[PDB]
Nucleic acid binder design. Structure first.
Ligand code: HG
Ligand code: HG
Ligand code: HG
Length: 552
DNA sequence: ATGCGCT
């Protein structure tokens, strides 16, 4: 009979059904299809999981997947063998598990296949050496999902009682706020430090202009803190004899960056196009659904060999040998890139202008990544004047390399060691150290991914939740901590230190991997977790004098 | 009258 294949993304399905044609019926779950809605029955009914009854759960189809589930039902009839083709990670593994329990049937009627790429060299091997779903992987995801549930449904209520109604707490949510709160306090406590700089304009023995910066005095870094000290020094430099000590000419290079991932795309779109995280993902979504780029949600900068041959092939025909490296550039889902290098942004007349701009950003990053380095001739001049040391640095572009596709938007006169320099003028400059920069939406996302706190598909969502909840606010595209955010962050740090530690997620991931690798059992892991958590929750419930949470 | 994180 006909084989039924199920994937997560519709766009990916349409593409698979092609490189497979008829005989098979490809479809997509379009997400999860099913999820959640001493002891207290009401609390357990609300959570959908019972921590006091060996974690029995109550999953139920999403209020917006009825059709999907239904249309998937009847399709199971005219199907001989059902092939669950979701992602190999634990989330994908769980979607497969839910599909199998919602469609019913017998285990043997189900098979698990993983698609490498769209190429036929992949969609083929998919059914070649398949397998079945990994129960350990599934239970690992159930453990994560349940731990996140307990925290949110059991901590928030405590907040409603001690602080205010409508408040929330969460493994990811609360540390994102903590990051903003700490930066806020960092800025408010900052005290600018005054420092001075002195530059000197001079003439070479020829007559050419040479700008110099004072670096040392009596062999110590030159850094006056007030005008008085700056004057004492200028007085000496005005009468000093200047002579060249050393001229170090050296070839230096510039290297392209890695292709984009969700976090970096958001940051680049934010810095070069003024796009907000949510907008960037909306445009990226359009581009993906129209087949111009790969999944917009990814945490890997990897590139397939085909992708790499495709781009080198393009660089070779459009730039020449000097731009093509001897062998592929090395560096530490796939990365976000054009599905076809031969497709220019200007040819996407079916897309909004902003989507074309985003595509162009993704395209150029992808092509520059595999080109040769930029080459410069860097010159450094060392100058002596009395007890002072002065410096001048220059650079002259010799070969653009990758900057040919990704442009950004210096000539030191000829002088030899021992040459005298004629002083023209001395310019003192007052300065003040500046406080740490405020977070931007993309900037906070960057910090979250750096600590492995969120997920590509949740970063944007996180940035919004903390605002709607009233913990932080955005102004001039920059984050500011709200009083409530500080209040909640301090309470949570006081009564749930472990949960508020930035590495809580990393530590959780380790335990989840152990469950996925038969090195631990999921219910046991949840039991340990719950025991610690309840110890903290119960303590927090008490009166402030007994160590309970301070009410506002 | 109510809250999480992920696809
Ligand atoms: Hg969803
Ligand atoms: Hg690269
Ligand atoms: Hg969704």
């Amino acid at each position: 009979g006909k084989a039924l294949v199920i994937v997560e993304s519709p766009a990916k399905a349409k593409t698979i059904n092609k490189y497979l044609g008829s005989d098979y019926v490809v479809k997509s779950s379009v997400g999860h299809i099913r999820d959640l809605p001493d002891e207290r029955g009401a609390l357990v009914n609300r959570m959908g999981v019972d921590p006091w009854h060996n974690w029995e759960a109550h999953y139920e189809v999403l209020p917006g997947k009825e059709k999907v589930v239904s249309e998937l039902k009847q399709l199971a009839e005219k199907a001989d063998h059902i092939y669950l083709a979701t992602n190999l990670d634990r989330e994908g593994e769980a979607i497969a598990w839910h599909l199998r329990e919602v469609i019913g049937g017998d285990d043997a009627r189900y098979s698990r296949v993983v698609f490498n790429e769209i190429t036929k060299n992949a969609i083929r091997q998919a059914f070649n050496k398949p397998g079945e779903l990994n129960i350990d992987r599934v239970n690992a995801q159930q453990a994560r999902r349940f731990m996140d549930r307990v925290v949110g449904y059991m901590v928030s209520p405590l907040l409603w009682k001690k602080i205010a109604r409508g408040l929330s707490a969460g493994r990811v949510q609360s540390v994102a706020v903590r990051l903003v709160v700490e930066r806020e306090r960092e800025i408010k406590a900052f005290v600018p430090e005054e420092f001075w700089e002195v530059d000197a304009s001079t003439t070479t023995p020829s007559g050419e202009a040479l700008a110099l910066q004072v670096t040392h005095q009596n062999d110590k870094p030159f850094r006056p803190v007030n005008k008085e000290q700056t004057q004492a020094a200028v007085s000496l430099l005005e009468k000093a004899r200047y002579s060249v000590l050393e001229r170090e000419d050296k070839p230096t290079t510039s290297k392209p960056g890695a292709p984009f991932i969700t976090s970096t795309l958001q940051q680049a779109a934010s810095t070069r196009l003024g796009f907000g995280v949510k907008k960037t993902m909306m445009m990226a979504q359009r581009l993906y659904e129209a087949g111009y780029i790969t999944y917009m949600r990814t945490d890997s900068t990897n590139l397939s060999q085909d992708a790499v041959n495709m781009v080198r092939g393009y660089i070779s025909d459009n730039f020449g040998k000097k731009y093509l490296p001897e062998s592929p550039n090395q560096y530490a889902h796939e990365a976000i890139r054009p599905s076809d290098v031969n497709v220019m942004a200007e040819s996407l007349k079916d897309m909004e202008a902003d989507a074309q701009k985003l595509y162009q950003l993704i395209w150029r990053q992808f092509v520059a990544c595999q080109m040769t380095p930029a080459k410069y001739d860097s010159t450094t001049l060392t100058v002596g004047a009395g007890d002072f040391r002065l410096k001048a640095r220059g650079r002259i572009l010799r070969f653009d390399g990758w900057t040919k596709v990704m442009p950004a938007l210096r000539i030191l006169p000829a002088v030899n060691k021992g040459d005298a320099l004629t002083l023209v003028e001395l310019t003192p400059a007052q300065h003040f150290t500046k406080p740490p920069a405020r977070f931007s939406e993309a900037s906070l996302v960057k910090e979250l991914e750096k600590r492995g706190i969120g997920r590509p598909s949740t970063y944007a969502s996180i940035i919004s939740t903390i605002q709607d909840r009233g913990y932080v606010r955005v102004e001039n595209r920059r984050f500011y901590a709200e009083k409530m955010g500080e209040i909640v962050t301090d309470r949570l740090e006081e009564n749930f230190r472990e949960l508020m530690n930035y590495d809580f997620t990393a530590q959780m991931e380790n335990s989840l991997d152990q469950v996925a690798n038969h090195e631990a059992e999921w219910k046991a892991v949840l039991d340990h977790f719950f025991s610690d958590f309840t110890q903290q929750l119960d303590k927090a419930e008490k009166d402030p004098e007994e160590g309970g949470m301070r009410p506002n």
